[PDB]
């Protein structure tokens, strides 16, 4: 699982892969780790597939019962204190890394990263999942803050594609959605139209010369591809 959420001027861009894998076997290759809480507030979802699904639909029922009694819109800081309350009083029993990102008219675009420990940190961009450790040095070099909506979509799709190329846990589709003052626009690009893959990376075309022919010199001349020559 590689999940991330990046803020721009208008709102936020949620990004995630699509694969639940029982250790080493792909149980599902079209998962949806972008969970709707309210219309403009979603959450990314990593870790245990059952422990985080039960939290996401328990928060989303407190959060819709709140919205009816208030009669107004729900702030993102409200939804991020319902995950922190539940991920802290269950922190020894669940495995839950949650990234809460959304839009409210008061504060604009907000990103909250709630790790497995149960803390809450408000950010500009957040990373999560087992594939997130590849993306710290990728965002230190290639990420500049203050992009547009069209640039954050193509960046976060290029960000996830570098993550599941090296990670074995992550893979599949790339599901992204933007949350701002307009309608929430979702987009799912496949594997075969992904912006990066190592199989078509032109520097991994040459095989590593392991299987040397039996020869008279120490001059390395590539692999042995035939029984005759």
């Amino acid at each position: 699982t590689t999940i991330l959420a990046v803020s721009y001027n208008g709102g936020v861009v949620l990004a995630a892969d699509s694969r639940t894998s029982s250790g080493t076997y792909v149980v599902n290759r079209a998962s949806n780790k972008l969970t709707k809480l309210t219309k403009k507030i979603y959450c990314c979802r990593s870790g245990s597939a059952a422990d985080t699904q039960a939290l996401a639909e328990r928060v989303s029922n407190y959060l819709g019962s709140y919205q009816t009694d208030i009669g107004a819109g729900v702030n993102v800081a409200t939804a991020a204190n319902l995950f922190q309350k539940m991920c802290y009083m269950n922190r020894w029993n669940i495995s839950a890394g949650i990234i809460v990102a959304g839009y409210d008219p008061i504060n604009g675009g907000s990103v909250y990263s709630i790790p497995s420990g149960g803390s809450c940190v408000k950010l500009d961009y957040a990373l999560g999942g087992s594939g997130s450790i590849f993306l710290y040095s990728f965002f230190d070099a290639n990420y500049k803050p203050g992009m547009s909506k069209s640039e954050c979509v193509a960046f976060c799709q290029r960000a996830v594609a570098h993550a599941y190329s090296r990670d074995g846990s992550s893979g599949g589709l790339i599901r992204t959605i933007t949350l701002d003052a307009d309608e929430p626009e979702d987009q799912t690009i496949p594997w075969n139209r992904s912006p990066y893959c190592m199989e078509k990376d032109p520097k991994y075309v040459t095989q590593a010369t392991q299987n040397q022919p039996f020869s008279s010199s120490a001059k390395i001349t590539g692999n042995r591809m035939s029984s005759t020559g």
Partner: protein
């Protein structure tokens, strides 16, 4: 035989006097509502009158939202109606957690009528002096369309569907106008513009005043926009002119 009327005890003619005295708390504020469903929408009109000019007129209301597809008006004792909204919001939410789907309107009316029956059978509890009118649109079966629904629960617990209902002071003259109007046309074939004229004229024939557009508030549910919302005041004025025509 000493009291006969002070707690929930059967009278010797077989009645409950604390039920019959809670019906009179509905007509005691002197207000009135009329609900009606057309072919493709539901309407609820109600008298929204503030006697004091020093009162903020967008705080006192009878139209509430239970779930994002069910609205209600509470006609009777006004703090009792706010109590049954909070009960119905708990039942619609605990239905959502336990069963995963949104609550049907006919089922939310039944589970609120079971709450009213308990309060008139245990001796200590007071009945709610308010008539609820839960309106919404249900998902029809075998075709997938939506369908207009009106459901009303008494203080005793008498739930039931309706084509057009009325509650409050002079609710008998409001029923009599709607049945007189029912003899000519067929109300499940009318449009939203045509059915809005009847529910506002039924509110006129009982009060005899031909009220202003700020002296009512109207909420509606439509097959295109299934969420409960209240109308703007500018759309009430386009209806009150047509009733005078």
């Amino acid at each position: 035989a000493g009291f006969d009327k002070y707690i929930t005890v059967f009278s010797p003619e077989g009645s409950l006097y604390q039920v019959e005295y809670a019906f009179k708390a509905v007509t005691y504020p002197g207000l009135l509502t009329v609900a009606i469903r057309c072919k493709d929408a539901v309407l609820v009109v109600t008298q929204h009158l503030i006697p004091d000019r020093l009162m903020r007129p967008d705080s006192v209301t009878a139209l509430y939202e239970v779930t994002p597809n069910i609205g209600c008006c509470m006609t009777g004792r006004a703090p009792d109606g706010r109590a049954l909204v909070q009960r119905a919001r708990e039942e619609a939410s605990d239905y959502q957690y336990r069963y995963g789907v949104e609550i049907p309107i006919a089922v939310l009316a039944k589970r609120m009528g079971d709450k009213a029956q308990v309060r008139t059978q245990q001796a200590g509890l007071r009945p709610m002096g308010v008539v609820s009118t839960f309106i919404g649109m249900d998902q029809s079966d075998q075709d997938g369309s939506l369908k207009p629904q009106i459901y009303t629960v008494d203080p005793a617990g008498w739930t039931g569907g309706h084509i057009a209902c009325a509650a409050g002071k002079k609710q008998v003259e409001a029923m009599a106008f709607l049945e007189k109007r029912q003899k000519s046309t067929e109300l499940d074939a009318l449009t939203q513009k045509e059915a809005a004229m009847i529910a506002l004229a039924a509110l006129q024939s009982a009060i005899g005043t031909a009220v202003k557009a700020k002296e009512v508030e109207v909420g509606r549910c439509t097959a295109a926009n299934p969420a409960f919302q209240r109308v703007p005041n500018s759309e009430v004025e386009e209806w009150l002119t047509a009733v005078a025509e």
